[PDB]
Ligand binder design. Structure first.
Ligand SMILES: Nc1nc2c(ncn2[C@@H]2O[C@H](COP(=O)(O)OP(=O)(O)OP(=O)(O)O)[C@@H](O)[C@H]2O)c(=O)[nH]1
Ligand SMILES: Nc1nc2c(ncn2[C@@H]2O[C@H](COP(=O)(O)OP(=O)(O)OP(=O)(O)O)[C@@H](O)[C@H]2O)c(=O)[nH]1
Lengths: 445, 413, 322, 447
């Protein structure tokens, strides 16, 4: 159907910048929204509509709604693509300067302008007929990202209860702001566990690691890291934009990937990629490297990373018998829990017909979204920091805004509830790993 | 000149028999003569402009002319007799084309012949008939146009005539509604009286305002059906015909002429031509029979539309009424005219009450309120029947199946 | 004539090639009718289906002569009974869902009906009917996952910590197994048979030499598809699983409204009728799980003992138990 | 039903709107600034009708059917300098009695009542110079002195002097509370006549006018000479189905029989989508129809807390097909809130873009307008009352409202003010009461 991107925060809008540059490259849209294709033909091989709007000028408008607290980043984006985005979707409301990188700042910016933001969302949905869901691009460390995305999730879990809420959350590597960062992380993770329908999780540590071990620039410029998130989102939605026989909706992807609305944190993996030592990595090699812990975008490196669901997306000249040999190897290799099935779903996707095969890029490239038992290890840093600082040395003087402001007791209660739901998520992941998950379900019959 | 040219052309091939280059010359001659006959029709005999001044008279694609006409003809039409002058109507038409946007045509240097073809004819309904229902407009075409443009030919279906009558219904309703609206605004605005009047006056004001709202409901439904017709049937088929007549003006490449059958089975018409395949090394216009087929196709498409098809067994009937849609709609229009009659009587007797209570302040002839209340019961009962019939027609359309009919019904509600 | 483009559009219509989104759109706009009445009921008013189709065709590309010529039809014979006229299968062993009777066809215009004969058109039509059945059950399981993760009645944490397992957890586990089976069957078919034959045909008209050679490649591709095991031998068990998944989606659409009467969220009220409902659901869910496991072991055994690709081994890897 | 329309311009703001309206009508008909048709004699085919809003003298020159009247001659004189010889200086009238002794309603109504003969003679002179006359177009600016007084006496005279013709004032309303006392006084005083005598009236709010002008004009130097632009745009789009006849709505009488259901609910609310008639972003016609319901596009105080639309009328201009109009109305019939006592619906009218306008690039195919008869129009009137009553109970400025009045007494002038306020109260009563489905049950069940 239709998928409206929702970018909330500085990290969210950086992801949006690189993601829309990519999606415009793939469909030959350029930086202004004008098709770089000669109008001599009226037949297209792709479906831009799930992510782009068509006006009477035959210009493509990305169905996105950019959010921020400092208009600087959104202005940077809209100036990089002059005339591409429709400014009637950009929203900051300029409700003063944010009083710190606090989750409460963003949450209150949302609670005070829910009217405006939901009017913008309603207007952008009004430009569609078959609407499917949202893409919420946002980090979990910052204040704007965490809080505004939390409020967006709370508003869209009920304001549009029949749509798929997808979050592509970049989590932080351990930084000097560890206290407020972990607090925002758990506060937003409350909503990511409670409201989002599917949450792709990116760990900034492994992102920076891979970005350094690929880019020629030794200093890891976080904007360069952004390209990996962009590539992952592009690969996920590639089965929808350039359609094939199987997966024409994120519903199918996630139904393949998500067993229950308690295990919906997906761990992306990708190999290879070169950006602005080839070895040609034949499709069998790609499907095998997909399981190499050195390629995951969340640091697991564990000896027992129990995979619940797997879904690989192979792009390019793919030889299905190579895929089948690789699936034999993996079904021998991958550790699946003894209570569920051992199916690895391979969607042999298409490369963008308008995107020429770039020199030193591989003939085949693959992406894996897996539902492992160890994506919670992204959350251990935050949970440890929260449980060893919130106990005595609370930083809750910043999070007193809006209704949370009314009492420090309020902030304490919300932090406690968020930690409780995060603990619930971790209990779910550690439980669904055991064979006893289905004992009292099918054996006790 | 053309005959000499092509006689030389053929006599220069008379020795090759009926060859393939004989057919080449045939194709060249066909293209040339058809192009020239279209160009002569347009530029010399105002074909396109007579098509337009047909859509703008008998199809009423220009409302100024019709309003001016119906104003100037109020004095004659409203005489419910056949003993009309029938020659004052000439001046009615002259002054209508004078007082419309068609005075730019009657005063045009070259297109005056287009407007000198417009004339009116009266139907035959018997004695006591009303000049409003006998009266019809027409267009008098002589050759060459009379060969290409199908109009009320003395033995055809006179489709232009029946269309003009069906829309003359709407136009009569519009005229009477606007006249009565002005009379009623006069009546209401004349109650600039000191509220110390007897409460009967305030009751009159409230009753008249509610009657105005019901009359407005009536007139909104009327104007809505009129707009639907003249925008989705007349204008739609006319835009289709005009697209056909200028087909060589680089239209969308819907070259695939499909044949569709009543059993749903479809197929291409004839052979699929190759995409301009070339091995070795000029408009495509329409001829006379093709132009007449285009005009007859336009008129048929208009009379084949479900809200025009009457008097046959091929009609699908609207459930919840069990009738053909046009019968329902003409019943609605007749009820509308009966309503405007009773409502004009109500406005007249209201003016009477007001001027009598301004002559003698509640002191004389207060018995008018009896007739007033009887007419009130009458108009409210007729409004009730009206709303019933509207619900019937909406149920008719909503259960037909065609998307446009469903949407019209929903818009009617 | 750009016969490459005509074959591309025919593969987009009947094979699903690079046209999955069009099939998904057709299903979403027509999800209710293709399951109605389990048949054409007294010449049911399935003309609305044709009207929807013509409405969509009005918004189709005009230069696509094939979709302009595509005629949606309702054949009075189910897909298995149509397959029984060519292959060694067995018919139903009652009306059966309307998509099983849905079909398509094109009156290929001259001269394009010289190469694209009526035999390859019948093959295209049967292949499209099968693909529509598969994509239809996949859309069923998609919207079932949607109702299982968007209705708070199912996300609710509770249910006596016993009812939650024996009802919701068993439901989600059986639904996950059904989804994996259906999606894996569709993956195997599409990218190991359909894709293989599309690629073979594409190889054929890379500088060909004979029109009869192109006809032979086309018909051989469609025959490799129609004689493929999952289209010619596993048809009865696929039908069984399809009935099972449709009954389960019915069960889910029913529980969507009939489950709000079990936990305190129902605010007789948690009376013994609620526990009777609960036990009936436990029994029906165990019934579904049992019949599915039985038919799935049947499917695995018919898979292993037959003979050929390794896509069959992928199907095994998907459905075999620990 | 059909005929010509005299345009009466009264007051400074009325005359400014008139200047811009005539510049616009000239642009949409190629009439030029002097009444000389800019159309070459090679194209003698006109599909329009300038005759309703222009008198075509035998000299191939169009005089706009207008009567410019005022008390301060400078503004009308400036207009005449801009339109050299366009207006007939035999139509102008200033009464040459000096500058107005204040900016109050009394001065206007008194200069009107002292020269009733001159005024009705000008209007009779303009009517005998035509045959089929239908109504008037008064540009008002209700809350000014000249505006209020001239419009009030005009309405008093033409309610009974031409008692078959559809009078329509186009009243602009101010936004600020700085001089709110005298301005709200004038507003209520003239609303007495905009309710008592007029047969129709459109309203605009200087607040929303300034907002939308600041939006669309890339100039923080927003002058009221850039809001009269939008006013003229609304008048032009209203009369488009007269200056370019088409299938359905020939004249004012028809559009009002559509718009104004009963003589009490006769204040109308404009709304217009992005437009080029002034000094692009692109949309479809479906986008136009959807944006017609934007609070930031309406020109009157919206306060769209579930507003009640009693009669909506769209006007779509350009390359538009009834398919997208039908789909947009399908969307908006389940979006606009129509009172349940009505079984009618929204009146859409497809209009012809002026052939003489510059050929627009198809980036801006369509433009649109919406007139609405909604209950929430009275929010411009409540601000006037909530000042008039409180400053009138204290008798503020009650001395400047006795100029030439027959009631030189303070008490009877206060009584007239309270009577006009009771008229406005009746207006708001009817507006809020029509929302009750029992409004028509006064006749429907009370048999
Ligand atoms: N990949 C990527 N990550 C970013 C980017 N900007 C910030 N981050 C990450 O997000 C964390 C902080 O979140 P921010 O996006 O800066 O949001 P914020 O801290 O609330 O700052 P404001 O949005 O201006 O209020 C940092 O620790 C970064 O690791 C970016 O542009 N790209
Ligand atoms: N559109 C527009 N409106 C104006 C303009 N000037 C004033 N107005 C409005 O008109 C109102 C004043 O009415 P006027 O028509 O000027 O009448 P007046 O107040 O007696 O002023 P004078 O003509 O000088 O006697 C103010 O409240 C403004 O809202 C203008 O230049 N353009």
């Amino acid at each position: 159907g239709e998928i409206i991107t929702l970018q909330a925060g500085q990290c969210g809008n950086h992801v949006g910048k690189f993601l829309w540059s990519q999606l415009a490259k793939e469909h030959a849209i350029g930086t202004d929204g004008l098709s770089q294709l000669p109008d001599s033909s009226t037949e297209r091989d792709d479906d831009t509509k799930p992510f782009f709007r068509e006006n009477c000028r035959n210009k493509f408008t990305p169905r996105a709604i950019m959010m921020d607290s400092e208009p600087s980043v959104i202005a940077d984006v809209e100036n990089t693509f002059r005339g591409f985005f429709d400014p009637r979707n950009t929203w900051v409301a300029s409700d003063g300067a944010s009083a710190g990188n606090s989750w409460a700042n963003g949450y209150d910016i949302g609670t005070r302008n829910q009217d405006d933001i939901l009017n913008k969302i309603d207007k952008e949905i009004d430009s569609t007929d078959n609407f499917e869901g949202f893409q919420l691009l946002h980090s979990v460390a910052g204040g704007t990202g965490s809080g505004l995305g939390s409020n967006l999730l709370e508003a869209l879990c009920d304001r549009y209860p029949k749509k798929i809420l997808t979050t592509y959350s970049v989590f932080p590597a351990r930084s000097s702001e560890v206290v407020v960062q972990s607090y925002n992380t758990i506060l937003a993770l409350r909503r990511l566990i409670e409201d989002s329908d599917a949450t792709v999780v990116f760990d900034n540590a492994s992102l920076l690691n891979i970005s350094g071990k690929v880019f020629r620039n030794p200093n890891i410029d976080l904007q360069h890291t952004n390209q990996l998130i962009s590539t992952i989102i592009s690969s996920v939605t590639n089965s929808i934009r350039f359609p094939s026989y199987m997966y024409s909706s994120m519903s199918s992807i996630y139904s393949t990937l998500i067993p229950s609305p308690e295990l919906h944190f997906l761990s992306p993996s990708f190999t290879p990629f070169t950006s602005d030592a080839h070895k040609c990595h034949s499709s069998y090699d790609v499907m095998l490297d997909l399981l190499d812990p050195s390629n995951s975008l969340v640091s697991t490196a564990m000896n027992n990373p129990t995979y619940f669901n797997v879904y690989n997306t192979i792009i390019g000249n793919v030889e299905p018998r190579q895929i089948s040999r690789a699936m034999t190897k993996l079904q021998q290799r991958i550790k699946f829990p003894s209570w569920s099935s051992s199916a690895m779903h391979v969607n042999i996707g298409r490369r963008s017909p308008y995107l020429p095969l770039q020199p030193n890029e591989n003939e085949v490239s693959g992406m894996m979204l897996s539902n492992m038992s160890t994506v919670v290890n992204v959350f251990e840093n935050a949970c440890n920091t929260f449980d060893k600082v919130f106990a005595k040395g609370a930083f809750l003087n910043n999070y007193n805004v809006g209704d949370l402001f009314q009492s420090m007791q309020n902030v304490q209660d919300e932090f406690a509830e968020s930690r409780e739901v995060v603990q619930s998520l971790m209990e779910d992941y550690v439980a669904a790993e055991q064979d006893s998950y289905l004992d009292d379900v099918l054996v006790d019959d | 000149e053309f005959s000499k040219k092509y006689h030389v052309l053929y006599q220069s091939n008379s020795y090759r028999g009926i060859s393939t280059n004989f057919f080449e010359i045939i194709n060249d001659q066909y293209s040339e003569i058809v192009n020239h006959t279209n160009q002569i029709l347009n530029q010399k005999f105002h074909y396109r402009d007579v098509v337009f001044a047909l859509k703008n008279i008998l199809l009423m694609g220009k409302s100024d002319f019709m309003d001016a006409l119906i104003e100037k003809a109020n004095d004659i039409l409203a005489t419910p007799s056949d003993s009309l002058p029938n020659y004052k109507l000439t001046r009615v038409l002259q002054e209508a084309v004078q007082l419309s946007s068609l005075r730019h045509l009657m005063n045009s240097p070259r297109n005056s012949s287009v407007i000198n073809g417009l004339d009116a004819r009266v139907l035959d309904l018997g004695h006591g008939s009303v000049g409003w229902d006998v009266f019809t407009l027409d267009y008098i075409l002589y050759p060459p146009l009379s060969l290409v443009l199908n109009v009320n030919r003395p033995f055809g279906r006179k489709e232009y005539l029946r269309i003009f009558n069906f829309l003359w219904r709407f136009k009569k309703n519009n005229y009477f509604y606007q006249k009565e609206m002005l009379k009623s605004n006069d009546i209401i605005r004349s109650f600039k009286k000191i509220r110390g009047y007897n409460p009967l006056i305030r009751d009159i004001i409230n009753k008249l305002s509610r009657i105005s709202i019901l009359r407005t409901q009536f007139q909104q439904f009327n104007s809505k059906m009129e707009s639907y017709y003249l925008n989705c049937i007349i204008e739609e088929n006319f835009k289709e015909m005009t697209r056909k007549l200028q087909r060589t003006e680089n239209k969308s490449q819907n070259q695939f002429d499909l044949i569709r059958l009543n059993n749903g089975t479809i197929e291409l018409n004839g052979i699929l031509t190759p995409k301009a395949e070339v091995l070795t090394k000029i408009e495509k216009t329409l001829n006379i029979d093709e132009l007449e087929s285009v005009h007859n196709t336009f008129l048929t498409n208009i009379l084949s539309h479900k809200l025009f098809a009457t008097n046959t067994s091929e009609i699908s009937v609207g459930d919840y009424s069990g009738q053909p849609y046009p019968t329902s709609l003409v019943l609605l229009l007749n009820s509308v005219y009966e309503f405007v009659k009773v409502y004009c009587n109500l406005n007249d007797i209201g003016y009477e009450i007001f001027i009598k209570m301004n002559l003698n302040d509640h002191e004389a002839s207060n018995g008018l309120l009896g007739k007033f209340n009887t007419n009130l019961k009458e108009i409210v009962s007729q409004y009730k029947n009206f709303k019933d019939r509207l619900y019937i027609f909406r149920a008719d359309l909503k259960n037909d199946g065609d998307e446009e009919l469903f949407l019209l019904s929903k818009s009617l509600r | 004539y750009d016969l490459i483009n005509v074959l591309k559009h025919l593969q987009q219509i009947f094979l699903g090639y690079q046209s999955g989104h069009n099939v998904l759109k057709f299903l979403t706009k027509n999800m209710g009718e293709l399951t109605k009445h389990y048949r054409n009921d007294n010449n049911a008013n399935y003309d609305k289906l044709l009207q929807n189709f013509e409405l969509e065709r009005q918004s189709e590309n005009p230069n696509n002569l094939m979709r302009q010529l595509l005629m949606i039809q309702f054949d009075t014979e189910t897909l298995p009974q149509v397959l029984s006229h060519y292959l060694q299968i067995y018919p139903e062993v009652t009306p059966k869902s309307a998509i099983y009777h849905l079909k398509f066809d094109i009156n290929i215009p001259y001269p394009l009906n010289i190469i694209i004969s009526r035999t390859c058109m019948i093959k295209y039509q049967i292949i499209l009917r099968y693909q529509l059945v598969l994509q239809y059950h996949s859309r069923l399981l998609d919207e079932t996952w949607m109702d299982l993760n968007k209705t708070p009645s199912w996300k609710y944490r509770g249910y006596s910590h016993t009812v939650k397992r024996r009802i919701v957890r068993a439901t989600r586990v059986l639904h996950a197994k059904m989804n994996h089976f259906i999606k894996t069957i569709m993956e195997y078919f599409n990218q190991n048979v359909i894709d293989k034959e599309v690629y073979s045909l594409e190889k054929c008209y890379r500088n060909p030499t004979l029109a009869v050679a192109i006809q032979n490649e086309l018909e051989g591709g469609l025959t490799n598809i129609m004689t493929n095991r999952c289209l010619s031998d596993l048809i009865p068990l696929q039908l069984q699983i399809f009935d099972i998944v449709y009954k389960f989606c019915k069960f889910i659409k029913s529980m969507r409204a009939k489950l709000c009467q079990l936990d305190p969220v129902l605010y007789g009220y948690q009376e013994d009728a609620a526990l009777e409902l609960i036990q009936k659901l436990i029994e029906y869910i165990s019934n579904a799980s049992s019949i599915f496991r039985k038919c799935l072991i049947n499917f695995t055994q018919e898979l292993s003992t037959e003979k050929f690709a390794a896509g069959i081994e992928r199907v095994l890897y998907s459905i075999v138990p620990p």
